[PDB]
Amino acid sequence: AMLIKPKRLQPGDIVATVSPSWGGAGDSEIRWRYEQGVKRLEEVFGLTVVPMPNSLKGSEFIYNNPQARAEDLMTAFQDTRVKAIIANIGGQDSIRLLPYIDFNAIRENPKIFMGYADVTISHLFCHKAGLSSFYGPAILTDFAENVEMDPYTVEMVNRTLFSNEMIGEIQPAPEWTSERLEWIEINKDTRRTMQQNNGYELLQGSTTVQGRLIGGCIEVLEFAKGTELWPEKKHWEDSILFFETSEDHPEPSYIKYWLRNYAAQGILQKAKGIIFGKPKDEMYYEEYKHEILQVMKEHNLEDLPILYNLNFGHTEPKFILPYGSMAEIDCENGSFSILESGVE
Amino acid sequence: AMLIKPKRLQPGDIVATVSPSWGGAGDSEIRWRYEQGVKRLEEVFGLTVVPMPNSLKGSEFIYNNPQARAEDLMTAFQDTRVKAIIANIGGQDSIRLLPYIDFNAIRENPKIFMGYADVTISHLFCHKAGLSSFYGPAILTDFAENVEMDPYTVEMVNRTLFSNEMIGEIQPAPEWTSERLEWIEINKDTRRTMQQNNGYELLQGSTTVQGRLIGGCIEVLEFAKGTELWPEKKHWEDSILFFETSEDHPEPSYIKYWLRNYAAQGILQKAKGIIFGKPKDEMYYEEYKHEILQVMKEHNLEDLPILYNLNFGHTEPKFILPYGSMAEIDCENGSFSILESGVE
Numbered sequence: 113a114m115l116i117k118p119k120r121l122q123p124g125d126i127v128a129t130v131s132p133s134w135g136g137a138g139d140s141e142i143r144w145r146y147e148q149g150v151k152r153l154e155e156v157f158g159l160t161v162v163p164m165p166n167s168l169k170g171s172e173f174i175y176n177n178p179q180a181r182a183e184d185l186m187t188a189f190q191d192t193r194v195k196a197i198i199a200n201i202g203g204q205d206s207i208r209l210l211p212y213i214d215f216n217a218i219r220e221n222p223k224i225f226m227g228y229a230d231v232t233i234s235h236l237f238c239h240k241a242g243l244s245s246f247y248g249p250a251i252l253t254d255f256a257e258n259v260e261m262d263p264y265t266v267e268m269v270n271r272t273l274f275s276n277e278m279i280g281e282i283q284p285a286p287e288w289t290s291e292r293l294e295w296i297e298i299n300k301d302t303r304r305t306m307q308q309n310n311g312y313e314l315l316q317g318s319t320t321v322q323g324r325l326i327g328g329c330i331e332v333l334e335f336a337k338g339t340e341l342w343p344e345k346k347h348w349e350d351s352i353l354f355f356e357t358s359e360d361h362p363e364p365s366y367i368k369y370w371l372r373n374y375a376a377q378g379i380l381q382k383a384k385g386i387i388f389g390k391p392k393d394e395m396y397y398e399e400y401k402h403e404i405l406q407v408m409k410e411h412n413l414e415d416l417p418i419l420y421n422l423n424f425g426h427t428e429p430k431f432i433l434p435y436g437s438m439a440e441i442d443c444e445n446g447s448f449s450i451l452e453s454g455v456e
Numbered sequence: 457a458m459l460i461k462p463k464r465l466q467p468g469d470i471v472a473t474v475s476p477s478w479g480g481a482g483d484s485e486i487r488w489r490y491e492q493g494v495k496r497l498e499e500v501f502g503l504t505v506v507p508m509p510n511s512l513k514g515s516e517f518i519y520n521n522p523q524a525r526a527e528d529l530m531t532a533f534q535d536t537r538v539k540a541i542i543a544n545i546g547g548q549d550s551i552r553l554l555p556y557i558d559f560n561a562i563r564e565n566p567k568i569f570m571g572y573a574d575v576t577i578s579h580l581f582c583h584k585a586g587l588s589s590f591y592g593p594a595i596l597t598d599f600a601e602n603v604e605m606d607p608y609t610v611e612m613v614n615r616t617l618f619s620n621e622m623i624g625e626i627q628p629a630p631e632w633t634s635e636r637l638e639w640i641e642i643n644k645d646t647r648r649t650m651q652q653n654n655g656y657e658l659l660q661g662s663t664t665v666q667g668r669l670i671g672g673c674i675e676v677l678e679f680a681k682g683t684e685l686w687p688e689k690k691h692w693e694d695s696i697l698f699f700e701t702s703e704d705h706p707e708p709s710y711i712k713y714w715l716r717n718y719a720a721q722g723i724l725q726k727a728k729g730i731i732f733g734k735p736k737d738e739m740y741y742e743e744y745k746h747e748i749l750q751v752m753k754e755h756n757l758e759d760l761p762i763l764y765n766l767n768f769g770h771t772e773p774k775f776i777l778p779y780g781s782m783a784e785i786d787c788e789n790g791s792f793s794i795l796e797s798g799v800e
Contacts (some may be wrong), residue, residue: 178754204713207720208754335713338681339720369548369679376551376683410552429795 113324114347115244116434117220120455123158124219125195129251131167133230135174135204137252137345138167144297146200149256156266157274164188167200169186175205182212189221196273199227199234200355201252202264206233207335215241224273224455226250228314229426230360232328236341239326239435246272246416246454247354248432252295259303262429272432272454279450282431284311285423290392299306305397307394310421315401316408317417317443322451323384329425330355330370331362337373348382350437356389357400358423363401371407380408385417385441387448389425397421417441421447457668458691459588459780460566461772464799465617468503469539470581472532473595475511476525477547479518481596482511488641490544493600494581501607501613503540508532511544519549525557529578533565545596546573546702546730551679553577559585568617568799572592573702573770576672580685583670583779590616590798591672591698591768592776602637606773616776616798623794626775629767634703634736642777651738653767658790659749661761665796666784667728669777671698673769674714675706681717692723700733700769701744708743715751724751728762731768732790741765741773749766763792 121127129150131137137146146168147208164184174181188197210233225238226246237243238272255263264285271409274429287306291298326347333355336342342425353374354393356369374380388404390398401420408414411422419441424430434454465471475481481490490512510518515543518525530730532541553579566665569589582589593599595658596767598609608629615623631650637643670691673676679700680686686765697718701711717725736740745764752758763785768774782794 205716206753207716210720277641311796331713334678334681335717335720338686341720355523360709372549372551373679373682375686376554410549 113437114242115239116242117221117456118224119195121157121159121196121224125159125196126193127153127159127161127196128191128194128216129161129167129198129200130188131174131200132185132209132234133170133206133352134201135167135169137200138170138174141297142252142295144300145252145256146293146386148300149251150196152255156261157269160373162194178205178208179212181206181321182209185237186214186217189217189223194223196226199231199250201250202227202229202231204221204230206230209233210341211341215328218243219316226432229329232332232333233341234254235328236336236343237437239343239347240341244434244436245405245430246434247306247346248272249430254428254430256430258293258300264423266413268431272434276453276455278453281447281449283427286308288390288423288429290427311339312422312446312448313420314443314446315405315420316414316420317385317441319417320440320442320444321352321384322352322438322440324436325354325433326435327354328356330367331356331358331360333372348379351383352441353383353386354424354433355380355386357391359392359426361392361395364396364403367400368403368407372402375407375411379418380411383416385419387419387422388423389440390423390427392426401431415442419446422448458586458666458709459583459778460586461588461800462538462566462568464620465503465540468504470504470506470537471497471540471542472538473508473511473544474506474528474532474588474779475506475518475544476529476553476571476578477550478515478541478545479511479513480515481544482514485641486639487512488508488644489596489600489639492644499730500610501618506538516577517786521551522552523556525631529553529581529663530558530561533561533567536565538567542592543575543578545570545594546575547570548574548616549578550574554683554685557581562587564626568777574676576676577658577680577685580652580680580687583687583691584685588778588780590776591614593774596639598774599774601772602644604694608767608773608775612775618777620797620799622797626793629653629773632734632767632773633721634771656766656790656792657764657785658753659745659762659764660758661785661787663759663761664784664788665696665728666692666782667696669698669702669782669783670695670779672700673702674699674711675702675704691728694725696785697727697730698733698768698777699730700705701735701772703736705736705739707779708740708747711744712751715748716749716754719751719755724755724760726755727760729763731763731766731785734765734771736760736768736770766792
């Protein structure tokens with residue numbers, strides 16, 4: 113392993129919230145939702161939440177100030193009190209933070225960093241600095257789930273961040289949702305409709321493979337390709353890639369194009385296996401499988417283990433993927449496991 | 457200059473035709489269209505046209521055999537009798553040729569290579585080999601135009617490939633088209649409806665900049681990012697970038713993402729100017745403008761000269777852009793010029 117494993121959380125610890133992308137958490141009509149997420153962090157996990165100075169100044173300020181976003185991260189990391197850093201929400205332009213990041217400040221201050229979607233860029237900040245981060249729940253989307261948090265997400269947070277024991281087998285969620293419910297306070301007492309779940313889907317493969325995890329939102333990863341933010345070649349060696357599609361529902365052909373580029377970099381030929389998150393609203397659920405299998409066929413990778421319909425990405429509930437942690441794709445059973453603890 | 461300038465073309469010369477991407481040129485109901493385009497090269501320019509062994513074996517074969525596609529490319533170069541190579545048509549999967557390219561075969565045999573769209577990847581083959589190639593007309597799209605080749609396209613071919621004089625100023629075409637007329641022989645005497653062209657639009661800038669051309673199809677350029685097919689850092693210094701959208705009609709927001717990536721690589725900061733080809737069907741004509749200007753605003757580049765609606769790309773008629781040749785954007789006169797000769 114080439115990534116520092118951060119120390120586990122425990123009640124009483126300080127957790128900093130940041131807005132590395134969209135600054136919507138500071139907005140007047142979305143603020144209620146942020147405070148609700150904070151409320152769950154304090155009550156369900158016994159944590160203390162401290163927002164970094166610029167993280168709530170509104171989406172207008174934060175957009176025009178990518179520099180202000182970066183120093184929030186630096187402030188959060190350089191603070192020895194802060195034990196974990198959780199992104200409020202994704203967005204789309206956190207790549208503008210690139211020339212303002214002190215990677216050394218991350219390397220010297222190892223701690224839990226969590227988020228997904230566009231926060232993937234921030235995960236590449238930690239990765240390059242040599243720090244293992246966590247692809248998982250964000251404040252506005254997961255910790256602020258109306259009425260009550262999903263027991264599945266809560267369980268997975270306890271196992272990955274609050275326990276130093278091996279995570280192990282990851283079971284599919286009993287139900288799932290991606291239903292659109294506007295973040296206006298009039299809806300805080302309304303539950304979201306849950307669709308029943310199917311379980312994991314094995315597209316191809318017939319052996320049990322083991323590799324370290326790397327990847328994220330497949331759209332967002334394109335933003336960093338060709339840049340200095342892109343991980344070294346040694347990181348892709350013997351790896352389990354995880355991809356997931358965003359809320360914008362990318363056309364099946366774009367999934368094909370992007371996978372073709374991973375083969376052009378030689379990444380797909382290095383992988384031990386691949387896992388895919390559940391598409392939002394299960395849109396293009398069948399079309400995506402066609403394009404994935406076509407690419408593997410085009411590049412003679414028809415024996416590379418691929419798991420489908422996992423509970424991570426733009427669908428709730430989620431589990432947590434620690435970057436660099438050893439994972440396992442059991443084709444014989446169609447199961448997925450993380451063969452170590454998320455935290456030291 | 458860092459790219460080798462090929463020898464000029466003259467009557468009697470042998471021109472090779474290749475299918476680096478879609479191999480539909482050899483299909484039984486399209487072969488007529490190939491022969492029509494060849495007929496013009498033989499009669500208008502007085503050239504001898506020779507098909508490469510695998511280039512007319514059909515779309516299905518050529519799709520399943522990217523190595524055979526590369527073997528055609530290597531054959532055309534290594535044969536000292538061939539003075540020019542012209543792609544038949546674009547596609548989407550020419551990136552799959554990469555594992556079969558001998559770059560030493562290209563740099564030991566400098567000659568004219570011309571094409572566009574997905575043939576951008578093949579231009580990067582020449583680019584890495586150190587050869588100046590020509591972003592322009594292909595066989596099936598331009599030369600095989602029904603009833604008659606557009607004089608504008610014919611003029612620019614003679615001014616770029618047959619003449620070792622300074623190309624000079626490129627004037628906008630009076631009319632334009634990208635109408636979908638099916639390539640079946642019954643439609644051969646039916647002409648395509650033309651649209652009116654309103655000239656070049658300067659989006660921003662007020663200076664006179666000079667730089668060497670580099671770019672291509674902005675969608676296809678994405679295929680090569682992060683790969684060893686991506687041009688060295690020295691090639692992006694003091695450059696005039698040319699981008700163009702394909703027939704897929706990419707979302708305006710995707711144009712924003714890609715330009716953000718160029719800004720994250722530091723490419724946009726090193727640019728002397730940027731030019732954009734007319735999008736197909738002029739779809740998202742005004743939407744693209746906003747996204748282009750929004751990106752420049754995000755990175756403090758609002759003084760960077762940007763020309764819009766030039767006559768290259770997925771629209772007929774076309775002019776030709778030699779990679780690496782010294783170009784110029786005159787914001788005062790709102791014009792575009794090439795201060796070099798396309799051929800030696």
